[PDB]
Design an enzyme around this catalytic site. Structure first.
Site, PDB file in Angstrom:
ATOM      1  N   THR A  67       0.798  -1.221   0.000  1.00  0.00           N
ATOM      2  CA  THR A  67       0.000   0.000   0.000  1.00  0.00           C
ATOM      3  C   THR A  67       0.831   1.272   0.000  1.00  0.00           C
ATOM      4  OG1 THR A  67      -0.158   0.034   2.438  1.00  0.00           O
ATOM      5  CG2 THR A  67      -1.956  -1.154   1.253  1.00  0.00           C
ATOM      6  N   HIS A 128       3.760  -3.955   9.886  1.00  0.00           N
ATOM      7  CA  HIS A 128       2.462  -4.364   9.349  1.00  0.00           C
ATOM      8  C   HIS A 128       1.545  -4.965  10.418  1.00  0.00           C
ATOM      9  CE1 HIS A 128       4.290  -3.608   5.485  1.00  0.00           C
ATOM     10  NE2 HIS A 128       5.088  -4.658   5.541  1.00  0.00           N
ATOM     11  N   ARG A 286       7.570  -1.387  -9.129  1.00  0.00           N
ATOM     12  CA  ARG A 286       7.006  -2.137 -10.239  1.00  0.00           C
ATOM     13  C   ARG A 286       6.484  -1.142 -11.268  1.00  0.00           C
ATOM     14  NH1 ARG A 286       2.135  -4.599 -12.193  1.00  0.00           N
ATOM     15  NH2 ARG A 286       1.019  -3.374 -10.590  1.00  0.00           N
ATOM     16  N   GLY A 288       4.058   1.655 -10.013  1.00  0.00           N
ATOM     17  CA  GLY A 288       3.816   2.888  -9.275  1.00  0.00           C
ATOM     18  C   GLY A 288       2.602   3.660  -9.742  1.00  0.00           C
TER      19      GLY A 288
END
Ligand SMILES: Nc1ncnc2c1ncn2[C@@H]1O[C@H](COP(=O)(O)O)[C@@H](OP(=O)(O)O)[C@H]1O
Length: 322
Positions: A67, A128, A286, A288
């Site tokens: 995220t 996380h 990757r 974005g």
């Protein structure tokens, strides 16, 4: 080691917990406290419960994976350190942002000797862990926190594509459609994702001076006001002279997707240099974009997850927050 002692202490307990298959054939997820874990991550949680000591001046980066964690590690590190380094000397130009903001349930557990964890000056940590499970020391310190969340469709695609890149796991991954089915049923590491977000949202509601609640898509569209707000919230607000000298715009550019992806340190198969990795640094950058899910999901799959969002977030205020 101290972590090996934790692992031994919770061995019997963790064996009594419900278990499920993950998105890889041999992968086993364990349920604890409403959420699914890899075994070692749950060990890392209990190790942090028992041993992590937060300070009131710490600053904690919180997210569900994929995220915007890498982006916020860069931003918070750059905000804290912008006066310590000439622009060309910034360590972010040389090392992936994860080296500078250690995870409570991973680095502190598995790799406690990395330099940043031995640095008594460092205030930055990340996690996380779901809000309801944070170590008491973190809850009781009053340290401030930032949480970021992202459209679940983009979050899912970011995860499924990222997992193709894990070391020694080629072919060991469920199809897009089967992976999406377990994501929607809440079966993912640290998931269910929507429960993760709701947990921090409710914390934000109760303690709105302690938590900055951010959304990937709105930051992506217009990062400068959010970076200024974050720096202020952190206690490192940009001064008038700094604004005159474009310093906030310099931080945004340094931590942008386009900068970090194109650094030599983050290209190819190069890995982090502080402790062992199962991903190349390049796996963290990757595309974005916002809306890449449009290239993978059908209207029927979109409706399923979008219906789960409406139902989970109904009557909470979440989708109204701006
Ligand atoms: N500096 C940055 N700014 C914005 N997005 C970034 C970023 N660095 C990484 N990303 C994107 O954030 C996601 C990774 O999240 P995390 O850091 O929580 O693992 C990936 O999304 P995509 O896979 O959609 O490209 C990645 O490309």
């Amino acid at each position: 080691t101290e972590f090996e002692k934790t692992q031994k202490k919770y061995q019997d307990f963790i064996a009594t917990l419900p278990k499920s298959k993950g998105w890889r054939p041999d992968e086993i997820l364990t349920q604890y406290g409403g959420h699914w874990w890899q075994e070692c991550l749950l060990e890392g949680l209990f190790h942090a419960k028992d041993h992590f000591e937060a300070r009131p001046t710490d600053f904690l980066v919180c997210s569900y994976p994929k995220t915007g964690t890498t982006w916020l590690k860069a931003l918070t590190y750059a905000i804290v350190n912008r006066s310590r380094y000439d622009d060309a000397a910034n360590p972010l130009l040389k090392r992936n942002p994860h080296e500078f903001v250690p995870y409570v349930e991973i680095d502190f557990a598995f790799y406690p000797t990395v330099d940043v964890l031995q640095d008594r000056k460092n205030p930055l940590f990340s996690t996380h862990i779901p809000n309801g499970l944070l170590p008491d020391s973190i809850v009781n310190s009053g340290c401030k926190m930032v949480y970021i969340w992202r459209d679940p469709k983009d979050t899912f695609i970011s995860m499924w594509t990222f997992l193709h890149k894990e070391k020694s796991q080629e072919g060991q991954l469920a199809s897009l459609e089967d992976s999406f089915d377990m994501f929607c049923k809440g079966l993912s590491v640290y998931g269910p994702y929507l429960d993760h977000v709701l947990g921090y949202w409710k914390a934000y509601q109760e303690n709105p001076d302690r938590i900055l609640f951010l959304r990937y898509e709105t930051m992506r569209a217009n990062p400068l006001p959010f970076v200024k707000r974050l720096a202020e919230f952190m206690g490192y607000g940009f001064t008038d002279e700094e604004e005159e000298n474009g310093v906030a715009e310099k931080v945004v550019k340094l931590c942008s997707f386009e900068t970090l992806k194109n650094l030599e340190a983050n290209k190819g198969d190069k890995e982090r240099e502080d402790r062992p990795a199962v991903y190349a640094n390049s796996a963290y950058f990757r595309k974005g974009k916002v809306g890449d899910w449009a290239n993978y999901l059908t209207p029927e799959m979109a409706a399923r997850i979008d219906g789960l969002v409406e139902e989970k977030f109904k009557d909470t205020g979440l989708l109204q927050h701006d």
